Design a protein around this ligand. Structure first.
Ligand SMILES: Cc1ncc(COP(=O)(O)O)c(CN)c1O
Ligand SMILES: Cc1ncc(COP(=O)(O)O)c(CN)c1O
Lengths: 412, 412
């Protein structure tokens, strides 16, 4: 029940040519495009009510504050948190995950404790844990993957022990398209006395998030992936855990009393927001949320399911293409052409107007698991169409034809 | 030689009324306004070439990358650094100062080492040092102020000893208007074997920065104070120091190899930029720099000197007003009306259209030093005029008249 033509009309950037062809943007997992509602929200902020926030002593100051804290409430309702105290604005999912690793992990890990992650994790959800286990002499472990790149709950029960303090796992893999059984993993973590930390950078833009239903302890997302400004994200954490964490960063705005040598902190959420905050970006993230909610996340999810089933079908009609990951998936396809390096694939597609990704996708352990150096990836969003998937598979067909010809021509 | 009318024409936000009066924005030390060149830079980015950066595999990706790294070069030239490797984009001065406290201070401080700051420092340049000395068992010391809120170099030579590892000091105080003798303090620090860390949040918008001439080891600034987007700042550090610091944050983008348990880092500057970066914000900061450079920082500085000398004169014509700090100053005046709380002052000014600040200005140790709870502050920028300073002092006169009347009327 969504109109794709009307949705595409709201995204100015879509209406242009690259190299003579109509742009075909299939790289939303790398970053999403913004509708006018979001860009005009930033314009209006800078044109009319920019001022510093949380003073409320002059009119613009009050309007800026109302917009910024108003956006916090919009985030709270968007992921179904209980309280704005549980919503911290950060620079992005990466920073959010680093805050947990710093303030939670490095304060609660002793030799013998385990942090458990998975082989499919983006680097954002790997490196902070490597550093934290190293600083504390704890142990890092990995939940194995099944043959189709999904996670077995039995493997989770086996990897997670009563020494596990943290489970950290992706909601949705940007590479495999896997949707992980987050809710069941939260119960397992909790049964062993662990917290679960969810990397929700790739789920939040594309499907309904309910932190009450997932019962996740921490949940991280990035504005830039969900039609919102760059430079902003959210750390959600259960209020009782956030209350016992020390700040990751220190400065003005996040203090209550400052003496010469000692300071006390503001209450949540401001405790974790040091310094002048990301005012225009958070307000534009609020606009992005109003925009996605007015279309409906279920509708968005339904659209992407239809794009992904269509793409999987049309890829299986191509000879000499491998697709990675399961059948039931988020709106993306990572793949390789036999004998064409994915970098060349992406380069040739760009000559056809088509924007994809090639490389390790910040998942180098997953690439080794897949037994490859690199792959190509197309990812979908609410502005993409089946016609665009046709152009993609038609271009892959011609790419295959072209590279096979060059080779035969170079058989001189 | 700058035209203020033509400069004001470029700032849409200035042209409105608040409470029936023309807006008089005198709160640029809290945050600056943006010209069209900056707002349209963000529009054009989101309307035409938003994409993820540092892949350069498709056309928009390449344009986004060229804009983002192009902005890095603009920052480098703007502060006269030697290399883009010395320019890290961060969330703001606060984050920048926290990075030094985390990666430099907490790795190089042992019991017996001193970190030396001053009583005039913003919280951003206090709390990170409090935490770092506490984590390492080092010692925090404070350079005293003279009676006019300036720093004596003799006091610096006395506070800084051969156990001092870090001197951290404001370039320009947001409260006193003091311009600190940064260059001479760098020599003293260096003679004792210390590094100097400069908080340049309040200097960078308003006067020419030359990190070669200052010989500062680290220098921090915020976009939002200098006509640029919120949410972005810079950490400059001498390349040889940055090369020996570990990252403050870990994740994708800032790695080279990721194994299961160990990782290696990118070269500078990317080593310190974890995760998708502040793409649109950094590009708009580049626009802000082109805009300020086209007016000329010396011209901006000259204008503010004339506003500040005018304001100091016209304040001294008011009865029962105290102004804090020295005669030679940056473009701002912090003050109190005898017997009117600064909060009431700022509230009454807003009813006249006039936007100032009241409170501790994130300098609680300085407020105790001044022997007050709070003050009011007006701050100037390149769009402000002497007519606006007249309205301010006329309004302070009427505020004084009004509060004195209420009191006499309440002498019933
Ligand atoms: C002197 C000074 N130092 C530090 C800061 C903190 O900068 P930010 O809030 O942009 O991180 C400010 C901000 N008004 C400042 O004026
Ligand atoms: C699954 C996943 N996790 C983490 C990240 C890192 O997010 P950011 O770069 O926005 O910090 C991404 C970003 N593409 C992602 O897709």
């Amino acid at each position: 029940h969504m109109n794709i033509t009307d949705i595409r009309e709201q995204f100015p950037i879509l209406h242009q040519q690259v190299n003579g062809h109509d742009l075909v943007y299939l790289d939303s997992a790398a970053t999403s495009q913004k509708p006018r509602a979001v860009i005009e929200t930033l314009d209006k902020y800078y044109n009319q009510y920019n001022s510093n926030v949380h003073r409320g002593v002059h009119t613009l100051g009050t309007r800026a504050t109302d917009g910024y804290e108003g956006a916090r409430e919009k985030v709270r309702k968007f992921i179904n948190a209980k309280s704005m105290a549980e919503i911290i604005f950060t620079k992005g999912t990466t920073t959010s995950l680093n805050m947990v690793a710093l303030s939670y992990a490095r304060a609660n890990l002793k030799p013998g404790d385990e942090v458990v992650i998975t082989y499919m994790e983006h680097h954002a959800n790997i490196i902070p844990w490597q550093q934290a286990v190293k600083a504390t002499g704890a142990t890092l472990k990995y939940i194995p993957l099944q043959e189709d790149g999904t996670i077995s709950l039995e493997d989770v029960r086996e990897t997670v022990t009563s020494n596990t303090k943290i489970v950290a796992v992706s909601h949705v893999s940007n590479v495999l398209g896997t949707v992980n059984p987050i809710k069941e993993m939260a119960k397992i973590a909790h049964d062993n006395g662990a917290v679960i930390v969810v990397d929700g950078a790739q789920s939040t833009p594309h499907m309904k998030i309910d932190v009450q239903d997932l019962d996740c302890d921490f949940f991280a997302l990035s504005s830039h992936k969900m039609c919102g400004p760059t430079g902003v994200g959210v750390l959600y954490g259960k209020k009782a855990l956030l209350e016992n964490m020390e700040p990751a960063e220190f400065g003005g705005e996040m203090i209550d009393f400052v003496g010469l040598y000692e300071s006390t902190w503001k209450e949540l959420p401001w405790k974790f927001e040091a310094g002048t905050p990301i005012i225009a970006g958070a307000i534009g993230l609020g606009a992005a949320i109003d925009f996605l909610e007015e279309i409906g996340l279920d509708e968005i999810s339904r659209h992407e399911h239809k794009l992904a089933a269509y793409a999987l079908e049309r890829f299986r009609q191509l000879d000499g293409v491998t697709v990675y990951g399961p059948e039931e998936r988020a709106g993306l396809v990572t793949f390789n052409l036999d004998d064409v390096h994915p970098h060349d694939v992406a380069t040739v597609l760009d000559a056809e107007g088509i924007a994809v990704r090639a490389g390790h996708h910040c998942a180098q352990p997953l690439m080794k698991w897949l037994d490859v150096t690199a792959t190509a990836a197309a990812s979908f969003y609410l502005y993409n169409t089946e016609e665009e998937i046709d152009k993609l598979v038609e271009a892959l067909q011609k790419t295959k034809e072209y590279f096979t010809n060059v080779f035969v021509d170079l058989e001189h």
